[PDB]
Tab-separated table of N, CA and C in Angstrom:
chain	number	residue	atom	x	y	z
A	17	UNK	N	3.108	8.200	-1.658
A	17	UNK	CA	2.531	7.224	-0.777
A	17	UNK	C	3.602	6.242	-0.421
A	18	UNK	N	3.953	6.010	1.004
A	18	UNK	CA	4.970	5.277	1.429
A	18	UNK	C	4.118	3.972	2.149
A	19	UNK	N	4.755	2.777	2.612
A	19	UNK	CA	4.422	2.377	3.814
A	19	UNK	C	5.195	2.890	4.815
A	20	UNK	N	4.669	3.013	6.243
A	20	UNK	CA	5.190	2.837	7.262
A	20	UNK	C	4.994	1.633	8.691
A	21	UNK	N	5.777	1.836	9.448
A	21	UNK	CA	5.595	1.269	10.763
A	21	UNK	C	5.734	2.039	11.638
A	22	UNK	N	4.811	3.153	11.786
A	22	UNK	CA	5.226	3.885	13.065
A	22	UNK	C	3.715	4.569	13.631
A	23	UNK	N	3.170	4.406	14.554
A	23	UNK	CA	1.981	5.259	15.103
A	23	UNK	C	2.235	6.548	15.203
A	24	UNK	N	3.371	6.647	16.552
A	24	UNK	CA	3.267	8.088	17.023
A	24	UNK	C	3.515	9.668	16.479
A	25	UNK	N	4.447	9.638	15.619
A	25	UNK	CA	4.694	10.476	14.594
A	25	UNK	C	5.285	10.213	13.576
A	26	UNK	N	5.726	11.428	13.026
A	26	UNK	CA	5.826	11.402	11.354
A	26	UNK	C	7.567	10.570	11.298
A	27	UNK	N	7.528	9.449	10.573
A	27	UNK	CA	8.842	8.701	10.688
A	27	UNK	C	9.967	10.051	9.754
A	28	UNK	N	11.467	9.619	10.139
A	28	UNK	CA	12.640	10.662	9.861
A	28	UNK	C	12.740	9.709	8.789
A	29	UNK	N	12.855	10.825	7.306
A	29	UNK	CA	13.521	10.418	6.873
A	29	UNK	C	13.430	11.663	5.087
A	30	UNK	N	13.731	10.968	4.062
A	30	UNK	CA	13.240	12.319	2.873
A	30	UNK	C	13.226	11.174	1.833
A	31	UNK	N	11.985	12.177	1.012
A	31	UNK	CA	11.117	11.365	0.155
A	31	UNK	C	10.500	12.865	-0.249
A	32	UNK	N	10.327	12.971	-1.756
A	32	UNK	CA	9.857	13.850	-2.675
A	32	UNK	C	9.000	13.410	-3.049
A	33	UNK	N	7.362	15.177	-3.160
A	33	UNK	CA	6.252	14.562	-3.679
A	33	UNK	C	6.291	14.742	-4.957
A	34	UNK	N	5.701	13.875	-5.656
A	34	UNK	CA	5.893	14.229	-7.493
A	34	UNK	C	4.622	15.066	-7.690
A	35	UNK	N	4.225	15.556	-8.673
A	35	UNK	CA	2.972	16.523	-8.918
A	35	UNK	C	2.044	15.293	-9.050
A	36	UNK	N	0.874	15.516	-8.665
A	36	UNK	CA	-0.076	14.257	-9.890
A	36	UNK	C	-1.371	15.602	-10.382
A	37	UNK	N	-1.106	16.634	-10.056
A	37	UNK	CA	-2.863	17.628	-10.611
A	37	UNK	C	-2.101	19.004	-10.306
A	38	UNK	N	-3.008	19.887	-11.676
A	38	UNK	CA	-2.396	21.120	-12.061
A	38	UNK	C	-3.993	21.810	-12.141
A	39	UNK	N	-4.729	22.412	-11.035
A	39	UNK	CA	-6.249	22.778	-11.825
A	39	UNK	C	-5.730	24.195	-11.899
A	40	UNK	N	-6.345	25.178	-12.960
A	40	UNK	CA	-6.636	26.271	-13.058
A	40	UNK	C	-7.951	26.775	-12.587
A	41	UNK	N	-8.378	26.152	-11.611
A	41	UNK	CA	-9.644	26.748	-10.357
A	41	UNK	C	-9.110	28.406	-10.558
A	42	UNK	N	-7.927	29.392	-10.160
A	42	UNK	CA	-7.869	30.828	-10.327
A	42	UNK	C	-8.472	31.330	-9.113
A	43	UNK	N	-9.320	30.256	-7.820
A	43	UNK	CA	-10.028	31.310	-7.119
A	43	UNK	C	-9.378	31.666	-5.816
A	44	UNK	N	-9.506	32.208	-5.497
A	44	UNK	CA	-8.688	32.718	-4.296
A	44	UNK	C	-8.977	32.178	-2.570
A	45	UNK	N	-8.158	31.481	-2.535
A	45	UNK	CA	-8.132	30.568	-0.826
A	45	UNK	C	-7.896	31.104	-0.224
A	46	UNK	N	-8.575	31.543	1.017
A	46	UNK	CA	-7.924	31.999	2.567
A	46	UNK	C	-7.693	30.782	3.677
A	47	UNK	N	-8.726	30.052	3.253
A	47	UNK	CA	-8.616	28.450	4.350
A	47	UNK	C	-9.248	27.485	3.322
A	48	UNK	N	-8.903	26.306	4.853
A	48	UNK	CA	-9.165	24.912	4.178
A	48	UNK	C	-9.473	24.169	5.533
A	49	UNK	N	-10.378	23.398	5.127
A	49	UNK	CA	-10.342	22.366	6.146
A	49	UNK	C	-10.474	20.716	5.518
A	50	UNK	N	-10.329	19.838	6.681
A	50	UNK	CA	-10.343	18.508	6.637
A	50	UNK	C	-10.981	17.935	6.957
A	51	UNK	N	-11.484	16.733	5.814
A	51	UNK	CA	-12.780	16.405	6.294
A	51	UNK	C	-12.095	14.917	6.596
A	52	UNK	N	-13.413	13.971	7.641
A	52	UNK	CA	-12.890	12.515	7.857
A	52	UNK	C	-14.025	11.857	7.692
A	53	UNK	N	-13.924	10.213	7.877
A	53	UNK	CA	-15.198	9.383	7.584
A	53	UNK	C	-15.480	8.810	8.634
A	54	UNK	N	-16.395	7.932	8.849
A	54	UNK	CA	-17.237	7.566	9.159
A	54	UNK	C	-16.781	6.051	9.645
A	55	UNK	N	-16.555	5.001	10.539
A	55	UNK	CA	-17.123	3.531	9.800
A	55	UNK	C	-17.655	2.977	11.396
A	56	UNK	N	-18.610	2.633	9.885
A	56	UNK	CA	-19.728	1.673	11.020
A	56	UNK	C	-19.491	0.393	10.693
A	57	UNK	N	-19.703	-0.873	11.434
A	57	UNK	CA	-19.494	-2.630	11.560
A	57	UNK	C	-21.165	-2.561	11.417
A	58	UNK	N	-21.353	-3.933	11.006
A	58	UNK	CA	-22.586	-4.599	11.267
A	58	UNK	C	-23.588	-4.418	12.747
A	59	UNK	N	-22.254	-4.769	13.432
A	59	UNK	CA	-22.585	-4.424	14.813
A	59	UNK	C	-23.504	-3.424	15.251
A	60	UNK	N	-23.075	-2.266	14.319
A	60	UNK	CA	-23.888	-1.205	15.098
A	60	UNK	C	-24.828	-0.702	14.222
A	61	UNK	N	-25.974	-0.372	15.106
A	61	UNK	CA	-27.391	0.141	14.356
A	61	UNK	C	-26.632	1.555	13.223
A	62	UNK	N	-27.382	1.629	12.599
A	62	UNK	CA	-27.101	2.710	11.643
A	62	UNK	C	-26.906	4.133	11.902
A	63	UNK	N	-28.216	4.162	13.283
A	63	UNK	CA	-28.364	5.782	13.505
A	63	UNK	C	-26.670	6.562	14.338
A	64	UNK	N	-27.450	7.691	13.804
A	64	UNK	CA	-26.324	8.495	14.467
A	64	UNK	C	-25.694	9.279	15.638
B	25	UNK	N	-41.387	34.728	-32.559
B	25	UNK	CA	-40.657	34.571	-33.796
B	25	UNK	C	-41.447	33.604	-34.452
B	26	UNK	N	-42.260	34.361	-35.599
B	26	UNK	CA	-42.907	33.689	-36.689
B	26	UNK	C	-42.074	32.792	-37.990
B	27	UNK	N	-41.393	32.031	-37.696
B	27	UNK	CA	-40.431	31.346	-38.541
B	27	UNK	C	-41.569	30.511	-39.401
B	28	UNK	N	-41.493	30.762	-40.708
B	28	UNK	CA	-41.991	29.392	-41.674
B	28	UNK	C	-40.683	28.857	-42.955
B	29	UNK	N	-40.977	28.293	-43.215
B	29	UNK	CA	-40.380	28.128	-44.575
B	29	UNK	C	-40.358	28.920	-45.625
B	30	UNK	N	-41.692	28.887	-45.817
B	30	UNK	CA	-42.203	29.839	-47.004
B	30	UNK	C	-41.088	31.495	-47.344
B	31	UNK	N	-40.994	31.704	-45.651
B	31	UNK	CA	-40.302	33.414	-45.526
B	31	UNK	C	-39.250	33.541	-46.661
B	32	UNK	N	-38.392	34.870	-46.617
B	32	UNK	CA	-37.389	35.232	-46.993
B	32	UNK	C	-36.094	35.208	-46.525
B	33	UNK	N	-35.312	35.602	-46.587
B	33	UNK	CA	-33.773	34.941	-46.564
B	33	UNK	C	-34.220	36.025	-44.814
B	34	UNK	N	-33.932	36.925	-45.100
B	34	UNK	CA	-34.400	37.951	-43.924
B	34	UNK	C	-35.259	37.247	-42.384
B	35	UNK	N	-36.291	36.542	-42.811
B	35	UNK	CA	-36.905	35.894	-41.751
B	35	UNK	C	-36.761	34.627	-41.329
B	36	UNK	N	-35.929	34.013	-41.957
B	36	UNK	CA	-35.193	32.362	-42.031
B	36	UNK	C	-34.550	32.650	-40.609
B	37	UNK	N	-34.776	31.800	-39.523
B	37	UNK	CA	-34.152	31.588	-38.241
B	37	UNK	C	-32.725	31.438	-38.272
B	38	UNK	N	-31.911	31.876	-37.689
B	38	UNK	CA	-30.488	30.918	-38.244
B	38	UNK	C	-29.793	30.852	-36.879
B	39	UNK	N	-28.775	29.718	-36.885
B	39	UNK	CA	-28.080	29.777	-35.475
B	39	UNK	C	-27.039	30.537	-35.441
B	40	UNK	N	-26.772	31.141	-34.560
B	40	UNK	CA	-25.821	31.966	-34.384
B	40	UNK	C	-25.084	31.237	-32.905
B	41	UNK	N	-23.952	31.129	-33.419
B	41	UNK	CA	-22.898	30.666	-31.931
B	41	UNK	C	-21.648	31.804	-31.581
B	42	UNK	N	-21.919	32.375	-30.894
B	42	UNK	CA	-20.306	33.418	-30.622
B	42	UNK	C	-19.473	32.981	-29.331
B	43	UNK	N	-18.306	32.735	-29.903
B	43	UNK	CA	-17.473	32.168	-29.136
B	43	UNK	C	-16.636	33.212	-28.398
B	44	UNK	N	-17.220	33.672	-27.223
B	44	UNK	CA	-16.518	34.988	-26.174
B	44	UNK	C	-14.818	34.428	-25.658
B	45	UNK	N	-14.152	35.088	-25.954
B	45	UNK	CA	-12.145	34.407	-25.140
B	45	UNK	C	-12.868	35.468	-23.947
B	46	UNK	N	-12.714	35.238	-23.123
B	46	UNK	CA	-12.681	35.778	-22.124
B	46	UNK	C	-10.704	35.533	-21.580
B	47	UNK	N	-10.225	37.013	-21.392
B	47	UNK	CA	-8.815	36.846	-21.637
B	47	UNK	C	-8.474	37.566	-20.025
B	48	UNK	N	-7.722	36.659	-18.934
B	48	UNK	CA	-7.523	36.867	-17.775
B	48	UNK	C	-5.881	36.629	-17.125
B	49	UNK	N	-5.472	37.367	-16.449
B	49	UNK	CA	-4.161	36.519	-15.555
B	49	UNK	C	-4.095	35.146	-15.517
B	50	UNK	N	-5.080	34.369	-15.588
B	50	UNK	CA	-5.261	33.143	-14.889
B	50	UNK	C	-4.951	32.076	-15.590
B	51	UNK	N	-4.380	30.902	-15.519
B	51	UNK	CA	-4.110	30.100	-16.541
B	51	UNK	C	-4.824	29.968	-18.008
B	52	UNK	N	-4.233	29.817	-19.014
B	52	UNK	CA	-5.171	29.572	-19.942
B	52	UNK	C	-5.507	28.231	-20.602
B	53	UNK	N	-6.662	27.763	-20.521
B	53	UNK	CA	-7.522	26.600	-20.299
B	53	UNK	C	-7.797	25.962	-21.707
B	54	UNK	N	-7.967	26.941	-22.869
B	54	UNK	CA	-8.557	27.056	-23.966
B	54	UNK	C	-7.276	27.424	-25.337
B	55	UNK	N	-6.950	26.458	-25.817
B	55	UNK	CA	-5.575	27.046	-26.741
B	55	UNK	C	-5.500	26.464	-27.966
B	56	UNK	N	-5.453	27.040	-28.812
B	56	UNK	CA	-5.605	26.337	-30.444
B	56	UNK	C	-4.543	25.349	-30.413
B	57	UNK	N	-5.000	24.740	-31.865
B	57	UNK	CA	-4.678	23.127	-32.205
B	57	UNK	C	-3.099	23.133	-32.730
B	58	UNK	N	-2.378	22.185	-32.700
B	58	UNK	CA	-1.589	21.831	-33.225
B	58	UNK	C	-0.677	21.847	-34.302
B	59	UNK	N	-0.277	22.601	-35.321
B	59	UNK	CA	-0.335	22.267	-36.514
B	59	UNK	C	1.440	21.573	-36.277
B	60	UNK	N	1.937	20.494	-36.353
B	60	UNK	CA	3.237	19.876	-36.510
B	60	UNK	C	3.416	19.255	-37.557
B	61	UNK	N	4.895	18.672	-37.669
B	61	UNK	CA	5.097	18.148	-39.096
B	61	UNK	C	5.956	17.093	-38.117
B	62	UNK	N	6.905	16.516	-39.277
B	62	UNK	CA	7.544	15.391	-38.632
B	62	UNK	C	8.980	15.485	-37.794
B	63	UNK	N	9.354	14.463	-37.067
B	63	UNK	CA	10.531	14.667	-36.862
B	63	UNK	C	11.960	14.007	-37.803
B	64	UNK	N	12.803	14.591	-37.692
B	64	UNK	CA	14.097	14.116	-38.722
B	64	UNK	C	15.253	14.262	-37.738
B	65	UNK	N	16.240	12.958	-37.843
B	65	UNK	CA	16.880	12.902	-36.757
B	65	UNK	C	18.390	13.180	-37.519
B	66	UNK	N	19.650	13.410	-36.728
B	66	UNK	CA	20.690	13.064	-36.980
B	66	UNK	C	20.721	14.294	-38.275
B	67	UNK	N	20.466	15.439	-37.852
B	67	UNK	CA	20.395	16.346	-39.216
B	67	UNK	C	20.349	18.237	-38.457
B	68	UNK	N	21.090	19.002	-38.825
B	68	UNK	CA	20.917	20.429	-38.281
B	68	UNK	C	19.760	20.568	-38.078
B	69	UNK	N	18.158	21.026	-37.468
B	69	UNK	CA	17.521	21.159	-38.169
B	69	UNK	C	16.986	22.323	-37.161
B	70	UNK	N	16.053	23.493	-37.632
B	70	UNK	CA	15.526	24.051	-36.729
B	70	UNK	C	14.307	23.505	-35.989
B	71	UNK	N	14.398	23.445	-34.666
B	71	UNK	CA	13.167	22.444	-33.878
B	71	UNK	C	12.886	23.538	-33.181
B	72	UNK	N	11.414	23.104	-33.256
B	72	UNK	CA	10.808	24.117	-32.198
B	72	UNK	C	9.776	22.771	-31.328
């Protein structure tokens, strides 16, 4: 986890990820997807 | 299963637990304990 200052793309530069999790899950992946959230203000009614 | 007290060694309920290794390619999750001794410094010693 870095800070940055940059919107448009990924800033130049090198930085190594360290491990933080080792699971022995064993099951076999073909895909993945990404999930995102949500945010609602006061402002707006709840529904969806 | 008519269990009382009264019965014989034969009809006495008993728990039974069997502990299955289920033994796979896959990481292993499950690994006996420890047995170590101390460390000694500044000395030949065989270390494992």
């Amino acid at each position: 986890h870095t800070p940055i200052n940059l919107v448009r793309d990924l800033p130049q530069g090198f930085s190594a990820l360290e491990p933080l999790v080792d699971l022995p899950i064993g099951i076999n992946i073909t895909r993945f997807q990404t999930l995102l959230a949500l945010h609602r203000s006061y402002l707006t009614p709840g529904d969806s | 299963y008519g269990f009382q007290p009264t019965n014989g060694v034969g009809y006495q309920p008993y728990r039974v637990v069997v502990l299955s290794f289920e033994l796979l390619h896959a990481p292993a999750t499950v690994c006996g304990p420890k047995k170590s001794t101390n460390l000694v410094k500044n000395k030949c010693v065989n270390f494992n």
